[PDB]
Design a protein around this ligand. Structure first.
Ligand SMILES: Cc1cc2nc3c(=O)[nH]c(=O)nc-3n(C[C@H](O)[C@H](O)[C@H](O)COP(=O)(O)O)c2cc1C
Ligand code: SF4
Ligand code: SF4
Ligand code: SF4
Ligand code: FES
Ligand code: FES
Ligand code: NA
Lengths: 214, 87, 43, 430, 263
């Protein structure tokens, strides 16, 4: 699928222009003050994520620039970007649809949610629509197992889908609307659909049950 | 990395001429002792053997690897240059 | 006493630079970080 | 007592689990958080470390080591290095969603436990490593960390105590292994999420080379209440050496999958039937349950009819509590194709540092794909079994361990299904 | 007066505090199997070939990294130790290529030789193997990376002996690959020493390639005159012809390295 060797091409080479915007330099100065002086190398990840958020993917020039800013060997940035799956080293669409397929979601017909997104967008996992608008791939447990199936589009979670529902989210995105993060079955979060079975009484205010002598 | 060929003492003879055979290019020799390699357990046994045989000998002392300080935990030093930048 | 609606909705407006702007406000309240004693391990 | 269940709503730590009431500072106060903290900090570390010891709290991350004893390795005189607490919000194992709710609906309990727990360990700051996919939860946490700073609850002279404390949120980049305590520590340092060997133990050489403790979100998020409501109160729930409440996730083939908080040692059948609404198609339709995330061995219906939910009941059944994430499967499932997916997950998550998990986990993945397709021989089952015993116990970290137990569990209890698919393949292609 | 006492199969050793299990066995003459560990590189601990049973402990410690504790009995040849080695060697070879006849290491390969001494004699791996594309890192060092066992000796040597932080590992899991990501030449006055420390044929010498086998060659222990350091070398010859220069160990001069000009 993906390759961990970079070969220069006209659209991705050490001279593809990348620079941090001046308002993304004041943000870097605040990332680097979170770590003890002398260990600025700990800032590689957030700053390398900062470049991606300001460009959507990481050209080899972007990576060579985090290295210059933080003063680390570029190879030490190449190791990081290739290790973690959230760094897009190949350009992606505007909306990056990530469909979970690990067992807890698989038991809830995550394949159907995937099968639908393939036909509706007319692509296959790993591809990118000719609009360069959508990018579809599978992923691993995104941490919302009790609300399966679910997809992540960019930075939001769209849980409890049904093949009908995901179709709705693919049109609000084509229409330019924002599809409202959250579940899709009436319940609001992780509570058991069909009324609550716990935490029914009002919470118990300050000072409750406090041991004596404190 | 094995160190099992570094235990015994060897006695070898000075290299002599080898030349190319005119017919085939093989390596010809007029030295009968070119492939002679005696093995001994101690430096003293090897000297005695050369002594009673009249061969002029030349001894080199055993080179052992000096003991070194290792420490996995040194790779993460809070403030020493031994902090590695990659695993 | 409500407990019939969802009162975690502010995330319906977080943009792409939210986490990184809060970290920028928080930089005024931090404390002086400890110093190893050198610029870096010297890569 | 011998019963454990129907925990009273007065005894639930995460009173805002479902996020119905406000999560910001004005609400977490009305629910008891940040109350008499300055009294707790001034009581010293030897009192806090005595509260965690007495409660028998065991880390909820998945290893279950006694929290009080573990936090006492950092209760030592300093040698000139700063000391740090690293809260593990990596939330990586499949099936577990508990930590998500704490960071999203009750972040002020997490910030408080960072101060309370940090004070016990003599730490100067807390790094909250959260997984990169939880962008909105991280923002919630940053919004709450600001509010506790503005009110003076953390920062310089926290709660008017004398102690100085900082809370940093560090976002991961999408790797399950960075949830490992020593891989986590390396990720915060700007490296690849590759676990370290032990020793040195983080209590000596940890983050940045400084003494460090790594704690799960659920572990720290209950330290303030245990100090407020006493050690004995938390010892009143669960069997001996299994004390406390617990956040249970129930997923898979249940009617109403949900995240609930419940007492420890509640029978697994009661946990499924009451809070989750039961197995789809009835209890008799139950096939097997994974009692705590994909790392732990599965168990069949027979062993699920009486087994409790705690670190020791599930160890006599040849599995473990893990993260207490409960994944249920009913007869219509394809059990072998479901465990084979956990292997693809571990194969896709291995850091690749050490040989047994590099080659073994992938090798097990290749074999399990043929068992699913039926294209193997019954003599490979013992071969795969053995290949797993060479992964388990020989790896740097416990991911290779957790990638081997699911395969062992399937072979232990579902061998006939493995050997019946292989028959149908041979005849079909003879 | 702080030499703790440890036991290697029963025989007692007085080692300095901080000595590892592997260094403890050096003294009673037992050499532990290894791939990743090298006495002049920082300890790595990932090949797991040094796993060794400590008496009365259930798990096996990595001999190359575990510091030794007083009163320990190291069981270098028990059943656990022998089974850990067989299992580990079995994984190293699962994705290794059948290259020994075309490999410049064959006949002096730590993977060949430790598979004969400590591994099994069979293969129960019935799957396809991996294949990694090669990198061109200069005219001296040939890379055939399908033979790499991801031991990271090259990475540690380059970083800490040559000071050239340009080799590292990209990728993850079974897809993890050593190299440079980009297309860089590993040019350095000490770069040729990766050929020696690479325990397999992944990094071999281009000038020497295909020309001889180890058993053929005669070793003459000489000195190097390309500079005034006087590095101790070994000159391999075959049938009256010079084949390759290798480093001879001399602790007080060149340790185990030579410059590329010497090599
Ligand atoms: C592959 C792997 C992943 C882990 N992921 C997590 C995690 O996401 N959250 C967590 O609290 N512990 C996780 N752990 C366990 C931690 O290493 C460690 O047990 C825990 O952080 C210690 O904190 P505790 O006191 O609460 O138990 C993981 C372990 C492994 C091997
Ligand atoms: S067991 Fe797997 S994840 Fe853990 S250190 Fe080894 S290779 Fe990495
Ligand atoms: S490195 Fe070469 S000689 Fe050694 S086992 Fe691999 S292919 Fe054979
Ligand atoms: S190239 Fe050689 S030295 Fe480098 S990791 Fe691979 S086997 Fe080890
Ligand atoms: S398995 Fe899909 S969110 Fe966990
Ligand atoms: S020699 Fe110890 S793990 Fe490699
Ligand atoms: Na080599």
């Amino acid at each position: 699928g993906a390759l961990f060797v970079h070969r220069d091409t006209p659209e991705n080479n050490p001279d593809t222009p990348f620079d941090f915007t001046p308002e993304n330099y004041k943000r870097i100065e605040a990332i680097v003050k979170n770590y003890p002086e002398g260990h600025q190398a700990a800032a590689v990840l957030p700053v390398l994520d900062l470049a991606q958020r300001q460009n959507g993917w990481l050209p080899i020039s972007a990576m060579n620039k985090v290295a210059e800013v933080l003063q680390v060997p570029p190879m030490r940035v190449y190791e990081v970007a290739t290790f973690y799956t959230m760094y897009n080293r190949k350009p992606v669409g505007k909306y990056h649809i990530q469909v979970c397929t690990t067992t807890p979601c698989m038991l809830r017909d995550s394949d159907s949610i995937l099968e639908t997104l393939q036909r509706k967008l007319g692509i296959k996992v790993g591809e990118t629509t000719p609009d360069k608008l959508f990018t579809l791939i599978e992923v691993e447990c995104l941490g919302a197992c009790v609300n399966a199936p679910m997809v992540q589009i960019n930075d939001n979670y769209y849980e409890d889908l049904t093949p009908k529902d995901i179709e709705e989210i693919i049109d609000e995105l084509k229409a330019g609307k924002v599809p409202k993060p959250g579940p899709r079955s009436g319940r609001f979060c992780c509570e058991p659909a069909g009324g609550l079975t716990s935490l029914t009484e009002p919470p118990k205010g300050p000072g409750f049950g406090v041991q004596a002598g404190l | 990395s094995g160190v099992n060929n570094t235990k015994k003492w060897k006695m070898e003879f000075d290299t002599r001429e080898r030349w190319e055979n005119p017919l085939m290019g093989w390596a010809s020799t007029a030295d009968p002792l070119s492939n002679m390699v005696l093995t001994f357990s101690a430096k003293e046994d090897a000297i005695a053997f050369a002594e009673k045989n009249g061969w002029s000998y030349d001894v080199e002392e055993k080179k052992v690897p000096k003991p070194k300080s290792k420490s996995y935990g040194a790779n993460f030093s809070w403030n020493k240059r031994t902090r590695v930048s990659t695993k | 006493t409500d407990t019939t609606t969802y009162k975690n909705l502010q995330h319906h407006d977080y943009n792409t630079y939210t986490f990184l702007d809060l970290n920028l406000d928080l930089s005024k309240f931090r404390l002086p970080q400890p110093s190893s004693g050198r610029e870096s391990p010297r890569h | 007592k011998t019963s454990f269940g129907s925990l009273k709503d007065e005894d639930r730590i995460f009173t805002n689990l479902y996020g119905r009431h406000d999560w910001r500072l004005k609400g977490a106060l009305r629910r008891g958080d940040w109350y008499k903290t300055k009294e707790i900090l001034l009581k010293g570390p030897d009192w806090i470390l005595g509260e965690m010891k007495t409660s028998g709290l065991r880390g909820r991350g998945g290893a279950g080591f006694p929290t009080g004893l573990k936090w006492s390795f950092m209760n030592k005189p300093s040698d000139g290095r700063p000391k740090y607490l690293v809260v593990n919000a990596d939330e990586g194992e499949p099936g577990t969603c508990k930590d998500r709710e704490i960071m999203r609906h009750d972040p002020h309990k997490l910030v408080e436990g960072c101060l309370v727990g940090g004070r016990a360990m003599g730490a100067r700051a807390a790094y909250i490593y959260i997984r990169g996919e939880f962008y909105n939860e991280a923002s919630n946490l940053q919004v709450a960390i600001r509010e506790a700073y503005e009110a003076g609850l953390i920062g310089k002279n926290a709660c008017g105590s004398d102690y100085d404390f900082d809370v940093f949120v560090v976002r991961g980049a999408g790797a399950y292994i960075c949830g490992e305590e020593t891989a986590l520590i390396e990720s915060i340092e700007g490296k690849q999420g590759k676990p370290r060997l032990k020793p040195p133990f983080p209590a000596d050489v940890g983050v940045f080379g400084c003494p460090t403790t790594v704690a799960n979100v659920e572990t720290v998020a209950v330290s303030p209440t245990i100090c407020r409501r006493g050690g004995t109160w938390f010892a009143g729930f669960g069997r001996e050496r299994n004390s406390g409440t617990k956040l249970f996730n129930i997923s898979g083939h249940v009617n109403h999958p949900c995240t609930v908080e419940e007492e420890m040692s509640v029978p697994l059948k009661e946990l499924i039937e009451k809070h989750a609404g039961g197995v789809t198609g009835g209890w008799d339709n139950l096939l097997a349950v994974i009692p705590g995330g994909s790392s732990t061995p599965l168990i069949p219906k027979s062993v699920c009819e009486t087994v409790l939910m705690d670190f020791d009941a599930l160890v006599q059944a040849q599995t473990g509590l893990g993260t207490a994430a409960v994944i249920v499967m009913d007869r219509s499932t394809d059990i072998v194709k479901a465990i084979a997916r956990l292997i693809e997950f571990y194969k896709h998550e291995s850091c690749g540092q050490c040989t047994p998990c590099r080659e073994g986990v992938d090798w097990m993945n290749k074999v399990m794909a043929r068992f699913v397709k039926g294209d193997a021989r019954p003599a490979e089952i013992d071969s795969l079994w053995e290949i797993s015993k060479q992964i388990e116990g020989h790896t740097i970290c416990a991911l290779g361990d957790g990638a081997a137990w699911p395969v062992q569990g399937l072979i232990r209890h579902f061998r006939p299904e493995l050997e019946d698919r292989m028959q149908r393949f041979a005849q079909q292609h003879r | 007066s702080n030499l703790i006492e440890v036991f290697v199969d029963g025989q007692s050793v007085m080692v300095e505090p901080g000595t590892t299990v592997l260094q403890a066995c050096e003294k009673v003459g037992m050499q532990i199997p290894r791939f990743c560990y090298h006495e002049r590189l920082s300890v790595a601990g990932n090949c797991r070939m040094c796993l060794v049973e400590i008496e009365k402990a259930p798990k096996v410690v990595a001999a190359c990294a575990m510091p030794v504790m007083k009163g320990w009995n190291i069981l270098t040849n028990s059943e656990k130790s022998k089974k850990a080695r067989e299992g580990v060697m079995e994984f190293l070879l699962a994705n290794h290529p059948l290259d020994c006849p075309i490999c410049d290491q064959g006949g002096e390969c730590d993977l060949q030789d430790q598979s004969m001494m400590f591994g099994s004699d069979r293969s129960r791996f019935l799957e396809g193997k991996r294949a990694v594309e090669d990198k061109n890192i200069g005219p001296l060092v040939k890379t055939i990376m399908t033979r790499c066992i991801q031991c990271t000796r090259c990475i540690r040597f380059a970083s800490e002996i040559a000071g050239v932080d340009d080799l590292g590992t990209t990728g993850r899991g079974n897809d993890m690959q050593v190299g440079t990501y980009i297309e860089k030449m590993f040019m350095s006055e000490l770069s040729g020493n990766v050929i020696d420390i690479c325990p397999v044929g992944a990094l071999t010498s281009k000038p020497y390639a295909f020309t001889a086998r180890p058993w053929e060659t005669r070793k003459t222990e000489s000195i190097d005159v390309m500079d005034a350091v006087g590095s101790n070398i070994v000159v391999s010859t075959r049938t009256g012809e010079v084949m390759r220069i290798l480093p001879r160990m001399h602790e007080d001069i060149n340790e185990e390295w030579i410059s590329d000009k010497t090599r």
